[PDB]
Amino acid sequence: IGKLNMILVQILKQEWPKHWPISDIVGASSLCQNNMVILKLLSEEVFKDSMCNEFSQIFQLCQFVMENSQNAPLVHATLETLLRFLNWIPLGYIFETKLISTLIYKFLNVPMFRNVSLKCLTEIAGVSVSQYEEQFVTLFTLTMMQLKQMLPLNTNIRLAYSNGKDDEQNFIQNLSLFLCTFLKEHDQLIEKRLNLRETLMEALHYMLLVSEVEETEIFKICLEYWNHLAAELYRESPFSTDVPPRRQLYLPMLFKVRLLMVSRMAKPEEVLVVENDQGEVVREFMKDTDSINLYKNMRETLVYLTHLDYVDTERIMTEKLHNQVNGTEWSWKNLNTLCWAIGSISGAMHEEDEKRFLVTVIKDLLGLCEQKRGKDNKAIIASNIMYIVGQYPRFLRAHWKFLKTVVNKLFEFMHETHDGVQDMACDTFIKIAQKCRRHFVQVQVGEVMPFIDEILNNINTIICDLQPQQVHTFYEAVGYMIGAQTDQTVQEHLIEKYMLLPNQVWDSIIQQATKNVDILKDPETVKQLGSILKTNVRACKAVGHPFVIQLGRIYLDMLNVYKCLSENISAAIQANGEMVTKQPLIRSMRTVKRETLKLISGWVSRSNDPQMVAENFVPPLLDAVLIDYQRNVPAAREPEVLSTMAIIVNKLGGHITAEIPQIFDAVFECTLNMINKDFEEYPEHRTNFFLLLQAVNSHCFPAFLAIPPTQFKLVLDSIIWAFKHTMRNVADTGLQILFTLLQNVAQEEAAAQSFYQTYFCDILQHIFSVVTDTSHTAGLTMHASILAYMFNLVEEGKISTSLNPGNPVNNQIFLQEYVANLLKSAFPHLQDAQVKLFVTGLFSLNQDIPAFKEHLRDFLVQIKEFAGEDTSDLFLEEREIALRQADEEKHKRQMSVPGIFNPHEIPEEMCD
Numbered sequence: 001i002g003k004l005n006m007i008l009v010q011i012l013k014q015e016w017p018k019h020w021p022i023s024d025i026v027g028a029s030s031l032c033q034n035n036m037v038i039l040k041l042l043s044e045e046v047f048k049d050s051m052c053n054e055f056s057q058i059f060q061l062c063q064f065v066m067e068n069s070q071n072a073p074l075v076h077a078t079l080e081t082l083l084r085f086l087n088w089i090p091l092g093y094i095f096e097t098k099l100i101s102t103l104i105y106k107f108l109n110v111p112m113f114r115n116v117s118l119k120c121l122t123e124i125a126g127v128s129v130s131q132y133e134e135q136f137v138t139l140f141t142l143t144m145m146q147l148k149q150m151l152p153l154n155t156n157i158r159l160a161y162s163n164g165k166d167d168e169q170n171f172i173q174n175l176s177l178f179l180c181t182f183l184k185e186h187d188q189l190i191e192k193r194l195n196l197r198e199t200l201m202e203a204l205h206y207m208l209l210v211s212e213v214e215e216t217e218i219f220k221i222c223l224e225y226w227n228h229l230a231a232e233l234y235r236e237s238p239f240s241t242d243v244p245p246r247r248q249l250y251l252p253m254l255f256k257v258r259l260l261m262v263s264r265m266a267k268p269e270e271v272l273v274v275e276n277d278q279g280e281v282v283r284e285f286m287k288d289t290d291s292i293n294l295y296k297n298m299r300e301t302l303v304y305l306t307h308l309d310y311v312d313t314e315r316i317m318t319e320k321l322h323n324q325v326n327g328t329e330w331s332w333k334n335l336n337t338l339c340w341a342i343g344s345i346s347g348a349m350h351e352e353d354e355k356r357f358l359v360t361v362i363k364d365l366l367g368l369c370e371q372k373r374g375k376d377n378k379a380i381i382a383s384n385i386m387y388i389v390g391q392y393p394r395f396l397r398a399h400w401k402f403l404k405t406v407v408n409k410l411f412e413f414m415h416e417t418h419d420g421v422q423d424m425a426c427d428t429f430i431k432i433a434q435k436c437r438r439h440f441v442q443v444q445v446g447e448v449m450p451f452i453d454e455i456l457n458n459i460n461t462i463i464c465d466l467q468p469q470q471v472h473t474f475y476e477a478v479g480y481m482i483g484a485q486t487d488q489t490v491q492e493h494l495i496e497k498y499m500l501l502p503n504q505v506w507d508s509i510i511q512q513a514t515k516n517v518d519i520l521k522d523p524e525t526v527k528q529l530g531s532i533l534k535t536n537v538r539a540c541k542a543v544g545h546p547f548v549i550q551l552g553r554i555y556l557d558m559l560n561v562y563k564c565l566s567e568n569i570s571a572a573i574q575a576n577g578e579m580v581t582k583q584p585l586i587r588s589m590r591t592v593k594r595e596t597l598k599l600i601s602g603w604v605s606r607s608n609d610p611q612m613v614a615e616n617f618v619p620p621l622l623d624a625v626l627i628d629y630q631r632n633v634p635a636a637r638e639p640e641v642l643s644t645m646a647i648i649v650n651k652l653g654g655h656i657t658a659e660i661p662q663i664f665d666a667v668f669e670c671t672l673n674m675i676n677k678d679f680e681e682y683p684e685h686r687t688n689f690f691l692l693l694q695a696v697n698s699h700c701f702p703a704f705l706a707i708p709p710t711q712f713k714l715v716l717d718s719i720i721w722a723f724k725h726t727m728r729n730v731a732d733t734g735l736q737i738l739f740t741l742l743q744n745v746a747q748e749e750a751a752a753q754s755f756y757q758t759y760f761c762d763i764l765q766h767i768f769s770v771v772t773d774t775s776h777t778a779g780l781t782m783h784a785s786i787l788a789y790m791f792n793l794v795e796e797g798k799i800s801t802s803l804n805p806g807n808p809v810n811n812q813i814f815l816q817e818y819v820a821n822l823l824k825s826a827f828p829h830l831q832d833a834q835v836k837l838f839v840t841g842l843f844s845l846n847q848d849i850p851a852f853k854e855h856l857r858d859f860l861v862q863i864k865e866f867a868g869e870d871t872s873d874l875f876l877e878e879r880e881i882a883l884r885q886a887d888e889e890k891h892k893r894q895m896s897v898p899g900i901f902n903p904h905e906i907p908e909e910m911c912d
Ligand SMILES: *[C@@H](CC(=O)NNc1cnccn1)n1cnc(-c2cc(C(F)(F)F)cc(C(F)(F)F)c2)n1
Pocket: 362, 366, 369, 370, 381, 382, 384, 385, 386, 387, 389, 402, 405, 406, 407, 409, 410, 413
């Protein structure tokens, strides 16, 4: 039978609404199950209004069979088929006939059909129309009356699911789905009925009970429902906490919802230390895409619920915590979840209320800590307390004494030997310093000297046990702390003391190399240089422009080291082969080179005085890098060279234009040959290459007129290869570069005319080739813009030269028959008059980009329809725009609700 199903599937793929526009349903008039399975298969071959009215033929027979047949397998199959086709069957059939009553009385109460029957009702609940309001109300009230008998509220759904059979678990899931969907789409319908409120409480009670099922999927469904309900009630009246109607109706059970939320809170990402299944405390090692989304939903729900009632949230939390300190419920799981909840509602709340809540929370946590002696408990408590103080910079910035105590204890934790406590401490140290910079540098109340100095004077001891990654983390934190010091005369000394330890190591290594360069081949020396350069990169990332004070100190030695490592690795590769790059020592040297380039790129991207950058830093970099990049084989070419060139060109523009020819002489031709041959070989080099090309085109276009034309040929060839590419991102970048290049070249007279005569027809031919080929339909707007631009330039007469070399002819007419011939070649079946009309319209629309786009799209769509080809992807950008608009709207809404985003996530950093 499988072969028949596959053959029918393939036949359906061959344009069902054209080749087979439902007739087989007649055969069901013992065989009905075969029909139902066939349509079940068809239900996924279907992806608007695909002649959907003929689904009524399915529904009529389904009602007939449903109303009259007792064959349980057949009933199940028919119910499944209807479950699929409720997405399209006309509404005037489902809501008018005996359907709802028929299955709610005849099947929903029967185990053989319970799950499918409830799923069918879920799909009916999924219909979202203002019509049939009374039928929806009847559906919900009757379904509740049924499932009340079938699953009484007194049942402990947690236990029933945990020990329940597979079908029972599926029934619990389907009940959750039905309740969630129906209340989402019709709660206002139910709430408007005074007498039904008790049944609404029954639904809410079911939601509470089913929310306690452990399995992640069930709780995800319940959480989505709770998120919807909380959002709706919050938006009913978000400014206060008399009660509005809906909130008044839901309040009698909101408390249980908050208790559920706090009890079951998922792990935040910032918590590195977790309890392992074997009963021990360890650092986290894996992540799940489910966890992040579940945590985000959990945070949304709980922040909405807190906005609904602040006092009650405080009460709940403070009581759970008072309980766990008392030892009534002491357990790492409970404390972890409670502290995750305490940190998750960070923000929101209010200022004085947050202070009041956190004072008691910190007191209770400290006492709990001071009571538990076991090392595992001491780690769990420390981790949780770190998470709390990490998520509440608002509290810290108002209490200097506590902030200093937290920082000192965090340093004490940095020495703690436990697996993940050090990482927790350093990550929290960033989260503190980043969001509380000014307090560290400004002399606070009572103290004599800024806290940054107590850090720097003891930095070596503070970093006397850290893993190198944690060392870079800590240096980045200190970098943020210094970065806020506005006084340059003090910031320079702070930087010098700040960098003093790695600068000492650097000076030692440089002195050793000067005495003998062979030291650079020692793996330990290379590793230390890599660590120092990573520290410098992170410090530059933090401090920003003032980092030049440190950078200029070591710049020349850094480039000398780069040259020495370049020579070493190049000689090694030349002597022993390309695979030499795989050796750990060679990889470490390449890491040193990569970090040098990254440091320069990082500093330049934040520099604000391009003149001095061009004068001092650029020429040594070019001398040290370009020849190496040209000479090395692909296996040893650093893509960070291209990235740095992109960044430097972007920042400097006209100040570096004179150097562009050399850069292209060294890089361009060498790198291009690596990209073209095989697409996947060097994705990073490809990306950095097109970044460089876009930057130089945008900010240093005159360079293209300086380089020899034989190489500008390669530039245009690379751009054309770029937009003809298959992958979306590279094609988009190619189109952007092409359009910018046209705009730029339009401004230089002789260059404009020569470029037109040499390439205009080639570029147009390639653009129409890609458009007709449709291989990159997503960029059709850019294609329309480019085509319109060229059509305008020719139409306005700005192309003074005759495009045809051999024929004295008008440019407009010439381009007209040229594009007509091109279109005819692409699609030989097009008629002459059709193409003539299309080209005349297209030319007439050169002045209006949206109109041009829609004209071209309509022409291409009718070509597809002649070919019978799918037109869905030809509107892909529009649908993508819709998705982006929806996402941006959601983001816009979330920022309006305090607490949904972490204090370390909002761009709107409050003062201090
Ligand atoms: C409790 C253990 C402790 O802090 N001190 N025990 C002593 C004191 N004197 C002599 C002998 N033993 N404990 C565990 N964790 C914390 C704690 C952690 C943090 C954080 F920054 F790491 F999150 C901060 C603080 C605070 F509130 F700043 F004190 C305490 N305390």
